[PDB]
Design an enzyme around this catalytic site. Structure first.
Site, PDB file in Angstrom:
ATOM      1  N   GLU A 263       6.877  98.048  43.711  1.00 45.51           N
ATOM      2  CA  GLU A 263       6.526  96.690  44.088  1.00 45.51           C
ATOM      3  C   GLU A 263       6.990  96.343  45.489  1.00 45.51           C
ATOM      4  O   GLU A 263       8.077  96.752  45.901  1.00 45.51           O
ATOM      5  CB  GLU A 263       7.137  95.722  43.072  1.00 45.51           C
ATOM      6  N   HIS A 286       4.884  90.161  39.605  1.00 38.53           N
ATOM      7  CA  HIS A 286       6.155  90.196  38.914  1.00 38.53           C
ATOM      8  C   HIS A 286       6.758  88.818  38.695  1.00 38.53           C
ATOM      9  O   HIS A 286       7.883  88.550  39.105  1.00 38.53           O
ATOM     10  CB  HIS A 286       7.167  91.094  39.621  1.00 38.53           C
TER      11      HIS A 286
HETATM   12  N1  LIG Z   1       8.108  90.505  33.643  1.00 42.47           N
HETATM   13  C1  LIG Z   1       9.236  89.850  33.864  1.00 42.47           C
HETATM   14  O1  LIG Z   1       9.452  89.153  34.857  1.00 42.47           O
HETATM   15  C2  LIG Z   1      10.392  90.118  32.898  1.00 42.47           C
HETATM   16  C3  LIG Z   1      11.371  89.132  32.760  1.00 42.47           C
HETATM   17  C4  LIG Z   1      12.430  89.286  31.866  1.00 42.47           C
HETATM   18  C5  LIG Z   1      12.523  90.439  31.092  1.00 42.47           C
HETATM   19  N2  LIG Z   1      11.556  91.453  31.225  1.00 42.47           N
HETATM   20  C6  LIG Z   1      11.640  92.690  30.404  1.00 42.47           C
HETATM   21  O2  LIG Z   1      11.233  92.586  29.029  1.00 42.47           O
HETATM   22  C7  LIG Z   1      11.770  93.754  28.384  1.00 42.47           C
HETATM   23  C8  LIG Z   1      12.313  93.329  27.036  1.00 42.47           C
HETATM   24  O3  LIG Z   1      13.206  92.249  27.298  1.00 42.47           O
HETATM   25  P1  LIG Z   1      14.138  91.574  26.180  1.00 42.47           P
HETATM   26  O4  LIG Z   1      15.013  90.661  26.962  1.00 42.47           O
HETATM   27  O5  LIG Z   1      13.366  91.074  25.002  1.00 42.47           O
HETATM   28  O6  LIG Z   1      14.978  92.831  25.705  1.00 42.47           O
HETATM   29  P2  LIG Z   1      15.650  93.340  24.360  1.00 42.47           P
HETATM   30  O7  LIG Z   1      16.533  94.413  24.860  1.00 42.47           O
HETATM   31  O8  LIG Z   1      16.175  92.151  23.647  1.00 42.47           O
HETATM   32  O9  LIG Z   1      14.540  93.962  23.378  1.00 42.47           O
HETATM   33  C9  LIG Z   1      14.019  95.246  23.670  1.00 42.47           C
HETATM   34  C10 LIG Z   1      13.524  95.734  22.349  1.00 42.47           C
HETATM   35  O10 LIG Z   1      12.973  97.036  22.598  1.00 42.47           O
HETATM   36  C11 LIG Z   1      13.274  97.813  21.436  1.00 42.47           C
HETATM   37  N3  LIG Z   1      13.038  99.230  21.703  1.00 42.47           N
HETATM   38  C12 LIG Z   1      13.700  99.982  22.601  1.00 42.47           C
HETATM   39  N4  LIG Z   1      12.998 101.068  22.930  1.00 42.47           N
HETATM   40  C13 LIG Z   1      11.896 100.946  22.202  1.00 42.47           C
HETATM   41  C14 LIG Z   1      10.957 101.954  22.051  1.00 42.47           C
HETATM   42  N5  LIG Z   1      11.142 103.144  22.623  1.00 42.47           N
HETATM   43  N6  LIG Z   1      10.016 101.756  21.105  1.00 42.47           N
HETATM   44  C15 LIG Z   1      10.032 100.672  20.334  1.00 42.47           C
HETATM   45  N7  LIG Z   1      10.973  99.734  20.451  1.00 42.47           N
HETATM   46  C16 LIG Z   1      11.910  99.839  21.398  1.00 42.47           C
HETATM   47  C17 LIG Z   1      14.721  97.467  21.212  1.00 42.47           C
HETATM   48  O11 LIG Z   1      15.201  97.979  19.970  1.00 42.47           O
HETATM   49  C18 LIG Z   1      14.669  95.945  21.364  1.00 42.47           C
HETATM   50  O12 LIG Z   1      14.495  95.226  20.149  1.00 42.47           O
HETATM   51  C19 LIG Z   1      12.862  94.304  29.283  1.00 42.47           C
HETATM   52  O13 LIG Z   1      12.386  95.445  29.990  1.00 42.47           O
HETATM   53  C20 LIG Z   1      13.039  93.233  30.337  1.00 42.47           C
HETATM   54  O14 LIG Z   1      13.406  93.793  31.604  1.00 42.47           O
HETATM   55  C21 LIG Z   1      10.492  91.291  32.143  1.00 42.47           C
END
Ligand SMILES: NC(=O)c1ccc[n+]([C@@H]2O[C@H](COP(=O)([O-])OP(=O)(O)OC[C@H]3O[C@@H](n4cnc5c(N)ncnc54)[C@H](O)[C@@H]3O)[C@@H](O)[C@H]2O)c1
Ligand SMILES: NC(=O)c1ccc[n+]([C@@H]2O[C@H](COP(=O)([O-])OP(=O)(O)OC[C@H]3O[C@@H](n4cnc5c(N)ncnc54)[C@H](O)[C@@H]3O)[C@@H](O)[C@H]2O)c1
Ligand SMILES: NC(=O)c1ccc[n+]([C@@H]2O[C@H](COP(=O)([O-])OP(=O)(O)OC[C@H]3O[C@@H](n4cnc5c(N)ncnc54)[C@H](O)[C@@H]3O)[C@@H](O)[C@H]2O)c1
Ligand SMILES: NC(=O)c1ccc[n+]([C@@H]2O[C@H](COP(=O)([O-])OP(=O)(O)OC[C@H]3O[C@@H](n4cnc5c(N)ncnc54)[C@H](O)[C@@H]3O)[C@@H](O)[C@H]2O)c1
Lengths: 404, 404, 404, 404
Positions: A263, A286
């Site tokens: 990005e 993003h």
């Molecule tokens: N686009 C954006 O601006 C933005 C903003 C905030 C967060 N995010 C992203 O969203 C994602 C999830 O965020 P969150 O805060 O809910 O996180 P979280 O850690 O609470 O949840 C992640 C989930 O993924 C599950 N998991 C892990 N690997 C997996 C896989 N291989 N297959 C199936 N399940 C899997 C975990 O068990 C967990 O329940 C993160 O990557 C975070 O960086 C993006």
């Protein structure tokens, strides 16, 4: 408290943080709506006690080595690698951040995008702007009655699942770990099953080796024909080229991508992606976390972590530090950061023993090469002052402080 | 159920209608995915008994008069002005339609549209597709806690409100007819109050000289600065040049328009509008009703109205005919369209009396100058057929038919 | 997990507790469906390490002192006064219980009870069982639209209210501590207002000299005539002779009592009360908590508290001990109960320092006159065992234990 | 309207009915809180225009033959056989009743009874009253999580299913006809399946041959061990003896019976049933419908049916009469009741034809030996008066009237 303790908030930190601080009595704040020029960053930080930054400023070794009064570092964002973590730890400086601080936003983004994606709106609109009228019912569907497929049932997956049910959808999910389904969400055993039956798939998985190009040619080819894919997690989970072929071959009706592999480092840098050829694709810079209310609670949260640390030694959630917190009750609390090695604690405890002072409560947690300990003593202001001077002399000491 | 009762369907009516006709034993179906020009329309509609048309086919007195075996007209849409109602009634030909057949679609559309408009997604996607990264997250907001001003708390307003509530928004409505608020909705006394108070304003009022150019340059002003405008009702309600000024002046953050003053005759026509210049404006080709589910339901509704009239002269929801329906029980059913003059019914009944035929049931409803009656008699096919002949020879007889 | 760590369970603790102990590798279990008399209790509890008891077993200082291998006490109920807390703490023996383990049960009970009381079902069933048909439907009412007055908006009040709302009732509550109303609940300023306004009055307040005989003859009067009274809290809150007068005077239509002033010691004891004469009064043997589901959960809760203490000295919800818990990570864990005098901790730590043993973590929380500390050290079984011995020989040492 | 038209309300009809009538202008009402003595019943009815009764008075042939001005009969109850239906029809007197007038009550009854039955409350209470304290948890369960089994998914089955889900249960149902499941109710194919998996079964089936002893030895033996049966529909659906054996053998944990095979004709008659031996059984005197609010809407409904008939000839829902109703619009409405035979209608229509009067709308529905017809004419008060006199003379006439 203490008008003598300096806080340096940088990069346009939310006003709500400034209010929090002030409510605590910490009124010595130096604000800056943007990132500081390396030269003045050092000029500002040297005498600073606390630094609140976002993600543009890079707090490296010689910058950290420039701040002589630095107590703690507050990252007003989830990302936390624009700072020399272990170089801070080494100096007894804990780093805090706001991890799960922007979930409602990301979920609001996904619901909205799927509604319109399912309607062909991104394309019809792209065309409307270009002067062509393309009214079709052909493959437009209502969200009500559709099956949503969440991969990664964590902080966001849950929210999305809840909101989606309000719109009349059937949410199913897949997680590497067994979760407790909220509302009427249904956990699915194998990804294949999910992929096979989901109209719109959304990824809310963390960044790590097992998720790298998780969704590739195979996985996509498993998605039912005419489905949608929405990736607002990490730009490394989806195989873009593979995604372009499905789009090109109408396997997928469209998609929404908010995070990419590489990005632009600034709005002044050109975005470039094969996904630009498709009208049936919503490309976003993003954002999703980038909402005013998110910035608002991020501020409240991290200014809060800095305050608690300041006031009572709590390091819970600290990124680069051992975690300790002690239920405050009783006067006189001191803290000690030192080298993790034999006899340090004993010598620390001796000071009080030999003064006939009673230790009310004590918590010590240790990392690889360092140990942190919070102590409560039934003593008076003077005796506290005394022991402090002594504490500092214990070989191994890196930092010691009287909290109250 | 008849092998030679020709059904002429044009403008691509959903497959479910085709399906339901056959289920009712109606096989002779001449389908057309698109519209048919006047010259070709005539050759087709000539020996046709029933015709199902939509918003593009125009049944003018000329065409209606060219239709010889035309028994009933079916509009697979909510609009009915494309056919000369009067020229149809005069021939004892009722017209049916689908009154409120697509409210959930418009509701889903606006929910999805506001969510993204609040977040700046339409403009971001525009620039991103032009190699421009635009992370300006300052104006991005969350729907939760915002105020939705609904002008026109009708079939759609009440629906849009319910969904809006699920997302955590606050709903306020301004209607001309004081109505019972569903959910936590609040009726506003004046437009000025609502306009000056709402974050998102959505119109859902009917077309008529009262709503023509409702949102003038003044109303646009009364709107809270930075707000959003969404119009998915009728193209005459908003003054577009005023709208454009507001957008360029930043008084409004964005808008979403689906219905325009002048709309393209077909998809091959050029679409032109000043709004095309704004990236922060969602332009759609009068969709929002165009949804498979809505089409399916309209298809199922109107076809069913055609069968019911064919099989048992029910004209319940007709927009040009007197509304009569009689419980289907017993043998022999006939019907008779005629001028609303004294004496016609007595002469109709006499036919059976002098024949010593017992009439089991009878319903006569009268239009301004027309009269429709349907009779159940206890006789058999011969007397029935013979009795049909007589009825057709009565002073002021427009039509007569042996339903069974 | 040990083969000779005797578990003494009495008063029929649910099978799920038994099940969870074994899961934790705890096999030596001496179960008893019923209570055990003092003479027999002693022989059993002697070489017992853990004991799970309920409302009937009485652990008096005498018995506690007769317990030699007694490490922890577990109360499978919300009450804990059946054991001498002080005589237990003094021996470094903490006691656990199930704080708020059965609220849904009492909630379900009252919902069902009011519904029938409103309808005259208790009296009708009484007469019907005596060959008496009684269709006097004049006083029968529907719950929907009625007013439920909840005195004591606590854990149960807030639950009872939610259910009451689902049936269509209106809820009003009177609490001593102004609280946040969940649902459409309305807090009343005075008891007089609520009493004079409610159709059904239910008590859910704690036992203490403040609530003793709360519903006196005067309060009963302030109640709307024809109303109902339901008490499933504690037996001291309602003045029963007053209650009886109200019933005979018809001022009250009926009542439902579950807790009495004086209650039978066991099921073989005679139950006596004046309320027995009234058919319109539902009398129950202090049930409403006695539900399989509640028992199952209590069984699962308290047993788990026992394991956690056994396996890693956590004393979190203890009612007599200092609350300490340390993250389980790393080898060698010991714990030490002792008098809260200056110097004991320094002498404890010294043991490892002079041995050049590195302490990884340590948590010391102190009671009024007692102190509990648990330590993680980086050593092995020998040093550990040898270090245990020393700790037991420290001035003011009450206990010491090698958790792992 | 008309203070000249007499209404005779008998058997303690609800006050709400008296208000309705009065709002309509009908102010000549003779009230009686109880059933009238045959001699005065005739004295009251002879000059009466409308009779409102309940279920105690028996309107037989010579009683009906005693009322010379009787226009309609209103049954303020669902039961309608205490009246000579066809003897009334024969005289042109329609009978109305209130069928689905008391469903909320019956449902409130069942929810309440199942909650407590599942708790063993009826027994524990029966014992408490007899002086024995029997506190047991043994087989007491919370409603939350249990499966309810509804047989007869009609007016009541639906309500019960809705309320039950609020208490946290899983509702399943069985109907002889396919129904549309409300909320999350689940239709089950075979009774056996239902019976096999239901904790509490409730019957809401109508009385007829196929339901006679529907639930017998076989069906009951199919119910899972420890289940409950609640019968509040018709006393002929459950094989009592078979029900006593399951209870006696602990196959069923308890049951609730509100309707029996033979019920006392008055409260002064002794109830007798094998079910009296069981404490775990709630016997109720056929109440459930007997609630004040039910009587309230029964009154509103049937006084309403009588008013509409009076005012505009509507016979919809009429028990012993052909059903007709005509959308009122336009002055002059007359009605005719006569023998169903040829030429009657023609002669009726001639009157207007030969007077040059226009018939606006006419509805005729016929039964076996009688025909009813409502007519609308565009005429004046005088001409109406005229035609009336003539209408009466048509051979076959039983009754004719000018409604307005
Ligand atoms: N686009 C954006 O601006 C933005 C903003 C905030 C967060 N995010 C992203 O969203 C994602 C999830 O965020 P969150 O805060 O809910 O996180 P979280 O850690 O609470 O949840 C992640 C989930 O993924 C599950 N998991 C892990 N690997 C997996 C896989 N291989 N297959 C199936 N399940 C899997 C975990 O068990 C967990 O329940 C993160 O990557 C975070 O960086 C993006
Ligand atoms: N864009 C699409 O594809 C599409 C699809 C379906 C319907 N429509 C539009 O949706 C509109 C609303 O549809 P509906 O079925 O909900 O409408 P409706 O006819 O059920 O209700 C409209 C409401 O507007 C109110 N009203 C009338 N004049 C008003 C005024 N001047 N100011 C404020 N309120 C006023 C009326 O009182 C009524 O309550 C229709 O008029 C039609 O234009 C468009
Ligand atoms: N019958 C049973 O088998 C059984 C089962 C469980 C609990 N209990 C009873 O339920 C009662 C309530 O339990 P809970 O967990 O909901 O209680 P709680 O302790 O959570 O809350 C009780 C509420 O009473 C309020 N209060 C205190 N004194 C009051 C007064 N004088 N006037 C008005 N309000 C007052 C408190 O402010 C508190 O909000 C307990 O006291 C206990 O007696 C009985
Ligand atoms: N206890 C009381 O005081 C009281 C009061 C009012 C009504 N009731 C009774 O409740 C019963 C149901 O009342 P409702 O008003 O809901 O009636 P309803 O007619 O609306 O519903 C009856 C349902 O039974 C279904 N059905 C018929 N036979 C069945 C069978 N053989 N197996 C499975 N399904 C069957 C029907 O299809 C229908 O859905 C009636 O007998 C009525 O008399 C009792």
């Amino acid at each position: 408290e203490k008008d003598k303790i300096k806080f340096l908030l940088v990069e346009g930190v939310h006003q709500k943080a400034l209010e929090s601080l002030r409510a605590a009595g910490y009124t010595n704040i130096e604000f800056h709506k943007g990132a500081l020029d390396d030269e003045q960053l050092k000029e500002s930080i040297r005498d600073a006690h606390f630094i609140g930054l976002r993600s543009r400023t890079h707090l490296t070794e010689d910058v950290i080595n420039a701040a002589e009064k630095l107590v703690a570092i507050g990252c007003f964002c989830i990302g936390t690698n624009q700072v020399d973590l272990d170089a801070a730890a080494k100096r007894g400086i804990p780093v805090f951040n706001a991890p799960f601080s922007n979930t409602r936003s990301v979920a609001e983004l996904v619901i909205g995008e799927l509604l319109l994606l399912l309607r062909g709106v991104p394309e019809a609109n792209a065309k409307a702007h270009r002067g062509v009228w393309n009214k079709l019912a052909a493959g437009s569907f209502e969200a009500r009655g559709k099956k949503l497929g969440i991969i990664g049932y964590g902080h966001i997956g849950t929210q999305l699942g809840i909101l989606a049910e309000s719109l009349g959808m059937y949410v199913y999910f897949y997680d590497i770990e067994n979760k407790l389904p909220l509302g009427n969400a249904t956990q699915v055993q194998h990804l294949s099953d999910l992929l096979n039956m989901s109209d719109v798939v959304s990824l809310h998985v963390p960044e790590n080796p097992s998720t790298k190009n998780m969704m590739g040619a195979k996985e996509i080819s498993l998605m039912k024909p005419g489905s949608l894919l929405i990736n607002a997690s990490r730009g490394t989970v989806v195989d873009i080229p593979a995604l372009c072929d499905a789009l090109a071959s109408k396997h997928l009706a469209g998609a929404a991508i908010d995070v990419f592999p590489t990005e632009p480092a600034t709005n002044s840098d050109p975005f470039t992606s094969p996904l630009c050829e498709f009208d049936n694709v919503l490309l976003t810079p993003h954002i999703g976390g980038s909402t005013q209310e998110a910035q608002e609670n991020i501020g409240l949260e991290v200014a809060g972590k800095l305050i608690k640390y300041s006031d009572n030694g709590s390091t819970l959630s600290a990124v680069n530090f051992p975690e300790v917190s002690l239920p405050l009750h009783g006067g006189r609390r001191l803290m000690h950061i030192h080298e993790n090695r034999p006899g340090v604690l004993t010598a620390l405890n001796k000071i009080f023993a030999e003064q006939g002072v009673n230790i009310a409560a004590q918590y010590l947690q240790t990392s690889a090469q360092m140990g942190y300990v919070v102590i409560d003593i039934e003593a008076d202001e003077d005796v506290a002052e005394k022991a402090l001077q002594a504490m500092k002399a214990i070989p191994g000491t890196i930092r010691a402080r009287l909290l109250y």
